[PDB]
């Protein structure tokens, strides 16, 4: 496959190989050495439909550390969908660059970019999913717990793009994934069903977070109103009463539970300060691993 | 000459030399060579007053492939001529960088930048002209037709910055150039006269596109309302009825006619989808050639 | 010390050593050497709260020339203190990059960034101070006058961030510094006192520019502020009558006096055209030296 649009576009063995390579190249960089430059003479255009810190800095810095040059095309720079159609952007950038990263709104825009591009496309977040984040999260789990297989991962909050990529991972690695969400804020039904069809993981959707978290290896949260839906924050506050991850919830989860959050976090909304800053919080190692997982994904896509 | 502001600031032999060099360096990059780095240790500031995908990505990527670093200064980053006088911008950037690219509104802003800069300045599009686009277009014609000399190029649409640079090329290479435009939307009379003064090319301005295109080697179009004039889009849509490039017009043009468009294109306005996507449309090879022509221009200006 | 937040966080010997290195590396780059690349494999995130030409281009170009990659994170890219707390930004970017440069409003935001970052932080301008600008200005003085020690520097204008960093330098190098400001627009009392405490320099605050400038080595001007309340703007205009640096004021200053201005300049407001363009004006060499002083600063912070 040419592109990295969803984790479960790939098989188990391939995903595990990418995660192994992620550890290997991370260790090389951590050693302080800077003479492994496989991307020398290669370029990446990064299309962003909305501003970013983690995705932007991790991709641009990682690509540089492996020898290439990433271009930042911000929202107003190329105005994809206003000034110019996706299919034309894809066909132009494919003639200049070796790979394209895109963070878009409608998922169909990333499918269109992939379909019309002759070079690989990497998904940097859409309204539907966030595969590179979950790949990083899998690496983080491997480093802290030992493995993803057989763990219990409990997401608390909105059934959103992050939950969809957790469901992708649950389609290629066998674990127990729970989404504790308010009624009416479930993840997409087809995405849940596709994970169940894979037959690897125990998948549960529940409205009771206090029961869901018990025995977790990971309690995961995210904002209740995502980029592109910030005008909905107030009604969601009401619907999401009881879904804040606070110290009491982490105590219910138990002593082996780590806290994870893709970031940015809104303290006092989906999570408390005390949770973010607790010893069991691994949000900053988690953020770092965006660069290491993505480096391995790009290596894979470019034939290394 | 220090700068690349207009094609016919240079003589015929120099323009032909730059186009040759464009082919040579293109072949080297297409071969996979990444060890020709003449711009090692050099920097370029790119000043953009306007949106850009082709100009931005072609300049930044090409400069990187030849070993240098291009800085992207977008519309709100330095605000040349508004936050700070152009003469001051020129004199500061000339002390940091080795070359400056600028995309501006008033042509006088680019003249000011060139006049006060000790380093070469490259025009990346003004309200007046767009010489690097037409240099790429000439390379594209050489590759598809064999040569520019003795061809018939028919531009259909607004008498604009693209037409001005076509007229620049017609001042240094002998061919037949027709601009078919609605009454009131003619190119600048002084620019037409300067092309005619050179005595190389047959130059016609007409309001009848259906006659104009007959026997064309190239039918060229562009948006009817350029950047900076988008408040006129509805008025222009009405004034330009009869100037859309559709499949019927390309049939009138004949069997040897290629379709070219600088891009971005607005299907259903100046051109149909069927024309943009036809076998005779070479818009994507055309766009690629921005990088190859500009690479040669920059090499020439920097003494290579 | 990990960070470069204010010049007099460092001792005299260290500041002099940095300025000596600034000359040495400048001379190496001026020779045409591009083989000294101490920042190979290193990255820098640059956080900007507002537009910038000098700080932006000098940091990005300089870091490139010494072998690293600087990322530009503009006002709408991360929103430090607004979309995401400074402590979170610090802890994320510290895991991707080797050094962070920040231009912020509240000084407390730069302190917070330094406190939470495991990597060095460089202050690129706050509401409080601008230490990299004054380090550049010291280098410029050394080159033109021969030394900072024993000179007379007269700043004419608002008691602002630039005055604060002048007072920082006067706390580590013995000279005579005068701030000639409208009554009511004095620099912060504590910053003046801290400079006096160091016991090196003669420090004067006055409201009489025509007397202040007599015998100056440097007459210094700066951006003048625009006002949010329209009667407050008119009152400020009235207060600053007599504080324009014109040819008459430079004549009163005398034959030894150079004119300096951190830029951008607004001719007809703080300074006249005739002064900016005069033979005694060194504003363009001054601007260049932002790159050379900052290169030495970054070298020092990174252990070179
Ligand atoms: N086994 C690879 C060692 C690291 C090497 N010195 C580097 O430059 O990455
Ligand atoms: N930075 C993580 C982004 C994920 C979030 N659900 C969003 O779509 O905003
Ligand atoms: N990308 C090409 C731009 C040319 C057009 N006439 C404009 O000025 O908008
Ligand atoms: N580019 C000048 C920076 C210093 C100025 N006093 C300001 O605060 O804007
Ligand atoms: Na993200
Ligand atoms: Na263009
Ligand atoms: Na109109
Ligand atoms: Na500045």
Residue numbers in the entry:
A (entry chain C), B (entry chain A), C (entry chain B): 72 to 375
Task: Provide passages from the article that reported this PDB entry.
The first step of the cycle, catalyzed by ornithine transcarbamylase (ornithine carbamoyltransferase, OTC, EC 2.1.3.3), is the reaction of ornithine with carbamoyl phosphate to convert them into citrulline, with simultaneous phosphate release. AtOTC, like many other OTCs, forms a trimer, with subunits arranged around a non-crystallographic three-fold axis. The AtOTC subunit, similarly to other OTCs, is organized in two α/β domains: N-terminal (CP-binding) and C-terminal (ORN-binding) domain. The active site of AtOTC is located inside a cleft formed at the domain interface.
The α-amine group of ORN creates three hydrogen bonds with side chains of N232, D293, and S297. This region was fully structured only when ORN occupied the active site. In a relaxed (open) state the loop fragment is straight and sharply turns around G299 to form a 3-turn helix α10, extending from residue K301 to A310. The loop bends, residues 301-303 move out from the helix α10 to form one turn of the 310 helix, and helix α10 significantly shifts its position.
